[PDB]
Amino acid sequence: IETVPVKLKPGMDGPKVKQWPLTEEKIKALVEICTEMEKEGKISKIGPENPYNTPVFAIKSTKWRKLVDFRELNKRTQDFWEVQLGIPHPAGLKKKKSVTVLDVGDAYFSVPLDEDFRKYTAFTIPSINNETPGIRYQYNVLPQGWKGSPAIFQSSMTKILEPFRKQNPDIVIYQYMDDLYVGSDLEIGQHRTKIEELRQHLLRWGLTTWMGYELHPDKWTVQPIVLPEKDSWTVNDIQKLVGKLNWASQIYPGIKVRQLCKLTKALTEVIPLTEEAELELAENREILKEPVHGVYYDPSKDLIAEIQKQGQGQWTYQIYQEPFKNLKTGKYATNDVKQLTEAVQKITTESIVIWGKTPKFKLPIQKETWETWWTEYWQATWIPEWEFVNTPPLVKLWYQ
Amino acid sequence: PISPIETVPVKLKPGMDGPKVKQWPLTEEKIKALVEICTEMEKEGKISKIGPENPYNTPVFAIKSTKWRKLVDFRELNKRTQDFWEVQLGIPHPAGLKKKKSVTVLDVGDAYFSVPLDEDFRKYTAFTIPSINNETPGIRYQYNVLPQGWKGSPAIFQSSMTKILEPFRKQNPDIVIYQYMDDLYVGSDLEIGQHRTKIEELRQHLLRWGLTTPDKKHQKEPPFLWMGYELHPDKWTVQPIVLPEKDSWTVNDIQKLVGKLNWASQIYPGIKVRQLCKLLRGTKALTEVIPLTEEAELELAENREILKEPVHGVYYDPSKDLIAEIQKQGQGQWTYQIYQEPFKNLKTGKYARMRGAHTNDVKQLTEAVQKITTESIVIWGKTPKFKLPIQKETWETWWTEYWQATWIPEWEFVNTPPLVKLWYQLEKEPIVGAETFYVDGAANRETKLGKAGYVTNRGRQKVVTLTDTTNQKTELQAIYLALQDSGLEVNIVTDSQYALGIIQAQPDQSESELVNQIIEQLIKKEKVYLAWVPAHKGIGGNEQVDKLVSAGIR
Ligand SMILES: Cc1cc(C#N)cc(C)c1Oc1ccnc(NC2CCN(c3ccc(S(N)(=O)=O)cc3)CC2)n1
Ligand SMILES: [Mn+2]
Ligand SMILES: [Mn+2]
Numbered sequence A: 001i002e003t004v005p006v007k008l009k010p011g012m013d014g015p016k017v018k019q020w021p022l023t024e025e026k027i028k029a030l031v032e033i034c035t036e037m038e039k040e041g042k043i044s045k046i047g048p049e050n051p052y053n054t055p056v057f058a059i060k061s062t063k064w065r066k067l068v069d070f071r072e073l074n075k076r077t078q079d080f081w082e083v084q085l086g087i088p089h090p091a092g093l094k095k096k097k098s099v100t101v102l103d104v105g106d107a108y109f110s111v112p113l114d115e116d117f118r119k120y121t122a123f124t125i126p127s128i129n130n131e132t133p134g135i136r137y138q139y140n141v142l143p144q145g146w147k148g149s150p151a152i153f154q155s156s157m158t159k160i161l162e163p164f165r166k167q168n169p170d171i172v173i174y175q176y177m178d179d180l181y182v183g184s185d186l187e188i189g190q191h192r193t194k195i196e197e198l199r200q201h202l203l204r205w206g207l208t209t210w211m212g213y214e215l216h217p218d219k220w221t222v223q224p225i226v227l228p229e230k231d232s233w234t235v236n237d238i239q240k241l242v243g244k245l246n247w248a249s250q251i252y253p254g255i256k257v258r259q260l261c262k263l264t265k266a267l268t269e270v271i272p273l274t275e276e277a278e279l280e281l282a283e284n285r286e287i288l289k290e291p292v293h294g295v296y297y298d299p300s301k302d303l304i305a306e307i308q309k310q311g312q313g314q315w316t317y318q319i320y321q322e323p324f325k326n327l328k329t330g331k332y333a334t335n336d337v338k339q340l341t342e343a344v345q346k347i348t349t350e351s352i353v354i355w356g357k358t359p360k361f362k363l364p365i366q367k368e369t370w371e372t373w374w375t376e377y378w379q380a381t382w383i384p385e386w387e388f389v390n391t392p393p394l395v396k397l398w399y400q
Numbered sequence B: 001p002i003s004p005i006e007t008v009p010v011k012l013k014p015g016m017d018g019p020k021v022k023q024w025p026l027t028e029e030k031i032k033a034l035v036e037i038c039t040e041m042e043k044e045g046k047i048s049k050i051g052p053e054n055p056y057n058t059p060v061f062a063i064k065s066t067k068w069r070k071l072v073d074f075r076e077l078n079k080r081t082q083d084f085w086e087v088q089l090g091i092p093h094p095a096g097l098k099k100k101k102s103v104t105v106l107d108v109g110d111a112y113f114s115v116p117l118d119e120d121f122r123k124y125t126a127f128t129i130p131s132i133n134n135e136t137p138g139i140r141y142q143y144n145v146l147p148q149g150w151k152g153s154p155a156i157f158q159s160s161m162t163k164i165l166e167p168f169r170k171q172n173p174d175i176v177i178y179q180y181m182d183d184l185y186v187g188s189d190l191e192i193g194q195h196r197t198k199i200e201e202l203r204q205h206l207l208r209w210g211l212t213t214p215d216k217k218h219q220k221e222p223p224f225l226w227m228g229y230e231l232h233p234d235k236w237t238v239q240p241i242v243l244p245e246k247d248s249w250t251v252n253d254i255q256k257l258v259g260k261l262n263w264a265s266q267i268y269p270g271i272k273v274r275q276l277c278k279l280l281r282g283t284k285a286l287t288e289v290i291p292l293t294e295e296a297e298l299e300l301a302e303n304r305e306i307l308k309e310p311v312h313g314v315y316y317d318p319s320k321d322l323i324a325e326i327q328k329q330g331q332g333q334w335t336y337q338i339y340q341e342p343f344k345n346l347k348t349g350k351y352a353r354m355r356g357a358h359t360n361d362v363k364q365l366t367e368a369v370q371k372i373t374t375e376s377i378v379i380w381g382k383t384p385k386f387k388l389p390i391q392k393e394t395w396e397t398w399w400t401e402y403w404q405a406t407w408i409p410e411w412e413f414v415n416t417p418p419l420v421k422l423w424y425q426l427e428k429e430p431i432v433g434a435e436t437f438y439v440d441g442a443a444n445r446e447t448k449l450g451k452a453g454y455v456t457n458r459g460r461q462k463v464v465t466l467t468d469t470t471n472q473k474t475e476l477q478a479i480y481l482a483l484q485d486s487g488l489e490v491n492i493v494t495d496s497q498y499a500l501g502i503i504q505a506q507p508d509q510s511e512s513e514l515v516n517q518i519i520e521q522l523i524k525k526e527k528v529y530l531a532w533v534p535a536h537k538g539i540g541g542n543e544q545v546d547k548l549v550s551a552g553i554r
Helices: A024-039 A071-077 A079-084 A105-110 A148-167 A188-203 A235-248 A275-289 A336-355 A367-376 A393-398 B028-042 B075-080 B119-125 B153-171 B192-207 B251-264 B274-280 B294-306 B361-379 B392-401 B471-485 B497-504 B513-524 B542-550
Strands: A043-045 A056-059 A065-068 A098-103 A123-125 A135-139 A172-176 A179-184 A304-311 A314-320 A326-332 A360-363 A385-388 B047-049 B060-063 B069-072 B102-106 B127-129 B139-143 B176-180 B183-188 B224-226 B229-231 B235-238 B323-328 B333-339 B345-352 B385-388 B411-413 B436-443 B450-456 B461-463 B489-494 B527-532
Touching: A024 A043, A024 A056, A024 A065, A024 A123, A024 A135, A056 A123, A056 A367, A071 A079, A079 A148, A098 A188, A105 A148, A148 A172, A148 A188, A179 A188, A235 A275, A235 A393, A235 B527, A304 A336, A304 A393, A314 A336, A326 A336, A336 A360, A336 A367, A367 A385, A367 B361, A393 B497, B028 B047, B028 B060, B028 B069, B028 B127, B028 B139, B060 B127, B075 B119, B102 B192, B119 B139, B153 B176, B153 B192, B183 B192, B251 B274, B251 B294, B274 B294, B323 B361, B333 B361, B345 B361, B361 B385, B361 B392, B436 B471, B436 B542, B450 B471, B450 B542, B461 B542, B471 B489, B471 B497, B471 B513, B497 B513, B497 B527
Parallel strands: A304 A360, A360 A385, B323 B385, B385 B411, B436 B489, B489 B527
Antiparallel strands: A043 A135, A056 A065, A098 A179, A123 A135, A172 A179, A304 A314, A314 A326, B047 B139, B060 B069, B102 B183, B127 B139, B176 B183, B224 B229, B229 B235, B323 B333, B333 B345, B436 B450, B450 B461
């Protein structure tokens, strides 16, 4: 085994990201992990000659796990992991009956990382009250979280999987970051038995290994823009319905509001439902049920996801590349943050399974509230890109 | 002594070569001073004589006070050298410090000149002492240690110092040592006998590693003046805050006052700085005299009272839990106190921030709770238990109904007036027997002429004219009109997503006067329902207002 040489771009410089303050339990949880890793030769204490920094966090049943935020590095590595060694995405995966996800991160700890690239993997375990200098380390092996690790490993991964794949040609296996996506049309017990067989292939070589047990991507359906059913329609009830439909007409080709606009009245007054409006309404209903005409996935373009707080433990979301032209819409159903972090994880997983990439999330929360809390509930090995937005009150209403 | 410690490898910036700066002809006094200076350094192995085999040069200088100081201009080399890791990520807060029986402050002698520079890098630190009138080849030299004024000296020094302490640290986990530049602060629960002995074990550990300290019996008596604080054994405080008695205040005087008050705010409760800040607003020369308002004179009076008596703070006991209390002290103004045992404050704080243009006490308090939450994780590594001037029901009613997601940790209501409340609540469904006001407010982009107005389900119609108003301003004055002319129960229809958004958000304070006027109206009303329709879509009521509203100018 030798090292695959890595390069950012001749102009692109490494990451220099601040470490978010960490709680006592997390710093202590990290010192344990980082010491064992240093002893095992996975990492190495570093000096000031390394001006680079990637944040570290600790996650969770009872065992603590080191999560490293490779967002900036992955952005700066891109050419290496997308073009130079890009893993292809199977269109089949999203069609499979059941999809099991397995953590294959332990495999990267066996492959050495290009000696010339290691400086960019620098991270810091901070000190409480800044009394001690703060422990610096860098990777020697392939790090978990960095998109370059699965790119390098793919060659060794294809070897491992070769028998299983030959033996089960109707099983689909995708590799996204530290995880394996395994899909089959098999009955549940049989799917589970195939996963177990798979674990063992990985066990030789060396691989121990908001969502249920597995994902069911064929059962995944778009939450339509719903038009309420009523026998009593007020002036306000129609006004809402007109505004909702008008907004949908910007996305859905075929939506008409004319017949409804055909009715200075008091909001509270009860206007009776016309023949042409009752038709238009029922017609629009059948349009919003079926997917959007004209919107397609452009691989070159970035995915964008919006989430709305619907209250009572309900959340709504929409995946698009070009604003409001929806690729997928859905829903998610104890505290606002735990719920959002849950919703985020679910949307990102669906996104991975469907397009082979994570969306940039538009978070209906204050920047600081999120950064402080997300880690307490975060459970994934990847971290999506996120921006903090103010949900326009209108969009919440339109998506129920 | 030059520490035996291994050298930190240094490189230049990629695609760059070393400095080749010409040494300016220096004065005879300066030449005589520099040679004398360099000779004593050469004998100590800090520098080494070189030939014209080396092609790099940096200008040297000299300054006087009878002592002569050697000034090296690393400006170019620093531009050419690689960036390093940030020396320290923060500074300790006295509130986070633990109680210790005894202290010793050791200061490291000739720090940068006591640490070796990477052999492969030395060539670039080359400097030349010119000959008199520069007629003959000067005396070429290069550093073997960290040069003074060079980019990586703080990084490389602190890095070394840390590695040198690491063994001693592991060997003495019950001893706290704080590193800051060429200073070392040692604390222990050991008695003056065992402590003084451990001090010498350290001084010697530093010596085995080429680092000299001062000497014994230099040690002082409490308080220990550290980083702008007074460090007593059981307490801490900010160093004497002198609030100047001045007749006339200049921009510079006010600026410094705000800095002193903000610094005092760490342990002195109820310190206010709003009114004094309002003064600094605008251009104004540093020396320009600024007449104090009644509000600023009142604020300074209150500040003088708080600072009339010395207030102290306690150290952190990691066995106990943190408790943070917040108090409202005017619009935008919030004051907090963190303690573990009732009113034995570890630290104090103020918070005044306007995230966006418009906000309410609930959003304001939540925002403060966050600022304190982060502050706590930084200082103590754990979140506090909160005591808030808001009813649990007031919170519940707000955060469930709001579209933004929030979560605040363990908190309890404490009855500390003024209490945080929602000054009004918009209706959920349209009101019956309450006049429906369809509003609109079109403005011309060129003539700047506004035309805010309304039409009602009761045939009332008013169309006012505005001067130099945006389409935003008019869409908002239309709502203020509907609010003014209406009864106690009102329905208001708008085509402005902007206006609705502002209003939906339930603000109780705003940057715009129009909004403050609208808020005042909202507070007064018994019931207010606010609906939205898409403009130009021909809505029965909306279309009707647009006719008389858009009539002339756009
Ligand atoms: C950040 C920092 C700064 C300084 C300083 N100066 C010292 C250390 C250890 C230092 O670094 C730390 C680190 C952890 N805890 C403390 N607690 C200090 C609080 C004040 N205390 C003290 C004890 C006796 C007396 S006395 N004997 O004068 O009454 C005066 C003060 C010494 C320990 N300091
Ligand atoms: Mn309007
Ligand atoms: Mn308008």
